Structures are given as structure tokens and as C-alpha cells.
Write an enzyme that holds these catalytic residues in place. Structure first.
Site, PDB file in Angstrom:
ATOM      1  CG  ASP A   1      12.306   2.050 -19.746  1.00 46.62           C
ATOM      2  OD1 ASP A   1      12.158   3.169 -18.778  1.00 46.62           O
ATOM      3  OD2 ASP A   1      13.099   1.205 -19.601  1.00 46.62           O
TER       4      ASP A   1
ATOM      5  CB  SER B   1      23.408   3.035 -18.256  1.00 43.68           C
ATOM      6  OG  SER B   1      22.622   2.468 -19.400  1.00 43.68           O
TER       7      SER B   1
ATOM      8  CB  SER C   1      25.683  -4.196 -32.782  1.00 39.82           C
ATOM      9  OG  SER C   1      26.258  -3.578 -31.927  1.00 39.82           O
TER      10      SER C   1
HETATM   11  O1  LIG Z   1      10.154   2.913 -12.388  1.00 36.80           O
HETATM   12  C1  LIG Z   1      11.101   1.751 -12.775  1.00 36.80           C
HETATM   13  C2  LIG Z   1      11.040   1.616 -13.920  1.00 36.80           C
HETATM   14  O2  LIG Z   1      12.187   0.410 -14.004  1.00 36.80           O
HETATM   15  C3  LIG Z   1      12.572  -0.101 -15.438  1.00 36.80           C
HETATM   16  O3  LIG Z   1      13.411   0.961 -16.044  1.00 36.80           O
HETATM   17  C4  LIG Z   1      11.276  -0.445 -16.133  1.00 36.80           C
HETATM   18  O4  LIG Z   1      11.636  -1.011 -17.177  1.00 36.80           O
HETATM   19  C5  LIG Z   1      10.516   0.627 -16.158  1.00 36.80           C
HETATM   20  O5  LIG Z   1       9.239   0.292 -16.998  1.00 36.80           O
HETATM   21  C6  LIG Z   1       9.961   1.084 -14.706  1.00 36.80           C
HETATM   22  O6  LIG Z   1       9.386  -0.075 -14.419  1.00 36.80           O
END
Ligand SMILES: OC[C@H]1O[C@H](O)[C@H](O)[C@@H](O)[C@H]1O
Length: 388
Positions: A175, A126, A68
Site C-alpha cells: 500500500d 474498502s 477529521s
Molecule cells: O496483497 C495483500 C495485501 O493485503 C493488505 O492490503 C496488506 O496491507 C498489503 O501489504 C498486502 O499484503
């Protein structure tokens, strides 16, 4: 270029560079619908260009080597195909192990070792989803080397499973889905309850998506998150006594509002309320988006921010400073924190031509106020993870 860099960085660390393959897995932003994913709600995220890149190849043996470029001080990491189950402190290879573990568990078979070099433009804290990028990177890499034909969705649910089950981080599919399903100049309208989604082209006119990083130094611990999850669950449970819902997401704002009594606790009431309101809001906001009513859209953005500021309580001086100051600016449709909260980034919808000035006007206040400087970046919508 970069590759060249990576590329040449591979023979070094790993010796040669033969039959090697290049991959990339992005980061993401959520335009709207925060902390809904795990509350059966809708979300409106998009994949950005900043991501994670990987150079990797198959091995002769069953060993796994990983480098990495972001943490060179670990030097190379290895393990053989049989320790995938045992994590190693809080090391990065953990994400690589878990994925293997999840992958196999779904019937897939990772029989050999391999090499893996990565570089990620996504900032540790971030809030732009570094974990998910990586999980997905691995996902596609494994999916490629071992020639599995992992369906994107599974691939995605597997990455969420690793996070959740292996890494041990509570979350929804937010995500993973964005990163997994990313498309150039497209956002995803996703119903978290059914996994039904719609790709929406980003149509902003003369407006840009400006990402504002609080750059806030914080503990990459995650309990507040975990409490939220906790909290709403409880609320949901209480609701469930008298209500036939599988999640808070099923409720109309009115329905929610009428039944606050089931809950009683004031704080619980706020959390779930944020969960209900937020979901419905997303629905409408996305249509606005779709209708080209950037304005209404931006107002909704602001609205999401305050709900999160006030009812869910996940913003903070930093996050609030950015969003609110940002809102104050001209040629700014609205602005809000994006992602988890508790620091990280916020985003803004700002007149292309006012951007340069926006950064200044907004940063200033911030530094003043927060004492420190924020970071500005204009979002760039790209594709989901892939073998390129
Ligand atoms: O929308 C809030 C957001 O917060 C974090 O990024 C979590 O990993 C996502 O799954 C979601 O719950």
C-alpha cells in the site's frame, strides 16, 4: 470546491486559516500479485483518485490538533509532541503519533506542534488502503512543515513501519509503495524482494478498471490476515531446512512443487503454494499487460482470484460472487478481488461501453446471492502523495 469546503471548515474548527497548506494522499488498487509482498514477490498496483486530503499548518507551541471531517463526533483531538509514543485506544491520531515516532527515529526532528484537518474519500473497510493513505498524508505533511527532505522510499518504509510497528498491523510495503510512488496513468511493477520497480503506463485501450465494493459488513479485526502471514512463514521456515531461500518468492513453481514434502501440512502447502504461484503469475501477467495482450492479462486476473479463493482462502462468498459473476459478463477481460481479501473490493476490466450494464448485471446477482448490494466505481489512476 471541496477545498473551499475544507478550507472554510478549518477556520471554524481551528479558528483562522493563515499560512495553511493543502495536501492529498490517495488510495490504491493492486492489479495483481496478492499476499506476495510479504512473501518476497512482485506486485502490480496503482494509486486511484479517491484518497485523503489534508489541510494543516505549523504551530506556535508543541501541541498537535486534529480534526477529521469523517468522524466529527470526536471533535478535536490534541496531544503534545511528547505523547507521540503512547497510543490512544484505536483512535486515528495514532497514525499521526506513529508517523511522528517513526519520523523522529530515522533522525528526523519534529520540534513543534501543528494543526491538522483531514477528509478521506477512502472507505473504512474498502480494502483500498485508508491507513497507508493517511500515514503517507502525514508523511508528506510532516515532510513539508518541518522541511524535512524525506526521501520518498524512506517516507514509505516509515509509513509501513508505523502500520506494522506502531499501529500493529501486519503487512508488506504494498500500500505505502503504491500510494507513495503513485503516478498519473501509471502502474508500478515492483519486486518486493529488492525494492526495484518500474513504472508502467496504464494502457487499457477501450477497457475500464471497474472497482466492485462488496460493501460487506465485517469486523475490522484482522486475524485471518495475521494467520496467513503466520502460515506462510511457517511453510517458509520448513522449506528453509533444506532450501536456501530467504522467501517463498525465490522459488519457481516447479521448485516449489517438487518440495512440498518439506512442509507436509496440507493447509500450509496451499498457502505457500498460493505464495509461489501468485508471484510467478504476476511476472508473466505484467509482461502481458506490457505486450497489450489484455486478454491473457485478464485471464491471469481470473487466475489470481481462484488461487486466492482456493489455495490461500481469502475471498469469500462476496468476493467470489463479484469476481466470478463479473467474469461471466461480456466485454469483461477478467476480474478478481484486490487487497487483503475477506470482503472489501474486487476489480474488473470491462468494455467502456458495457460498463453501465455491467454494474447492473453484476449487482443484481450479488444482491440476490449475497442478499445485499455491491458498490461500483470505475478506477481512476492518479499520482502518489504530495503537497497538492
Ligand atoms: O496483497 C495483500 C495485501 O493485503 C493488505 O492490503 C496488506 O496491507 C498489503 O501489504 C498486502 O499484503
Amino acid at each position: 470546491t471541496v477545498l473551499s469546503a475544507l478550507t472554510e471548515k478549518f477556520a471554524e474548527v481551528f479558528g483562522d486559516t493563515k499560512e495553511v497548506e493543502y495536501f492529498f494522499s490517495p488510495g490504491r488498487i493492486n492489479l495483481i500479485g496478492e499476499h506476495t509482498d510479504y512473501n518476497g514477490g512482485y506486485v502490480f498496483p496503482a494509486s486511484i483518485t479517491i484518497g485523503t486530503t489534508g489541510l494543516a499548518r505549523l504551530r506556535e507551541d508543541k501541541k498537535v490538533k486534529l480534526y477529521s471531517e469523517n468522524f466529527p463526533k470526536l471533535g478535536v483531538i490534541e496531544f503534545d509532541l511528547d505523547e507521540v509514543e503512547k497510543k490512544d485506544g484505536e483512535l486515528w491520531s495514532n497514525y499521526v503519533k506513529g508517523m511522528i515516532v517513526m519520523l523522529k527515529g530515522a533522525g528526523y526532528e519534529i520540534d513543534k506542534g501543528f494543526e491538522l484537518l483531514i477528509k478521506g474519500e477512502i472507505p473504512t473497510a474498502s480494502g483500498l488502503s485508508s491507513s497507508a493513505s493517511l500515514e503517507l498524508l502525514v508523511g508528506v505533511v510532516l515532510d513539508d512543515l518541518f522541511n524535512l527532505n524525506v526521501p520518498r522510499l524512506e517516507l514509505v518504509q516509515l509509513g509501513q513501519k508505523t502500520e506494522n510497528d506502531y499501529i500493529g498491523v501486519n503487512s508488506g510495503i504494498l500500500d505505502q509503495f503504491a500510494i507513495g510512488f503513485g503516478e498519473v496513468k501509471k502502474a508500478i511493477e515492483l519486486d518486493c524482494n529488492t525494492l526495484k520497480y518500474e513504472m508502467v503506463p496504464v494502457e487499457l485501450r477501450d477497457y475500464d478498471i471497474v472497482i466492485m465494493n462488496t460493501n460487506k459488513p465485517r469486523a475490522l479485526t484482522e486475524s485471518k490476515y495475521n494467520e496467513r502471514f503466520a502460515e506462510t512463514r511457517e511453510a517458509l521456515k520448513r522449506m528453509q531446512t533444506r532450501l536456501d531461500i530467504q522467501s517463498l518468492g525465490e522459488l519457481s513453481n516447479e521448485e516449489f512443487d517438487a518440495n512440498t514434502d518439506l512442509i507436509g501440512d496440507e493447509t500450509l502447502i496451499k498457502r505457500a503454494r498460493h505464495a509461489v504461484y501468485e508471484n510467478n503469475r504476476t511476472k508473466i501477467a505484467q509482461k502481458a499487460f506490457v505486450a497489450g495482450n489484455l486478454t491473457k492479462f485478464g485471464e491471469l486476473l481470473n487466475a489470481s482470484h481462484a488461487s486466492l479463493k482456493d489455495d490461500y482462502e481469502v475471498t469469500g462468498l462476496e468476493l467470489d460472487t463479484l469476481a466470478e459473476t463479473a467474469q461471466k459478463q461480456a466485454g469483461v477481460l477478467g476480474a478478481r478481488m484486490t487487497g487483503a481479501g475477506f470482503g472489501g473490493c474486487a476489480i474488473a476490466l470491462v468494455a467502456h461501453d458495457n460498463v453501465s450494464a455491467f454494474r447492473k448485471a453484476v449487482g443484481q446477482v450479488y444482491e440476490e446471492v449475497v442478499g445485499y448490494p455491491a458498490s461500483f466505481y470505475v478506477a481512476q489512476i492518479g499520482s502518489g502523495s504530495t503537497k497538492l
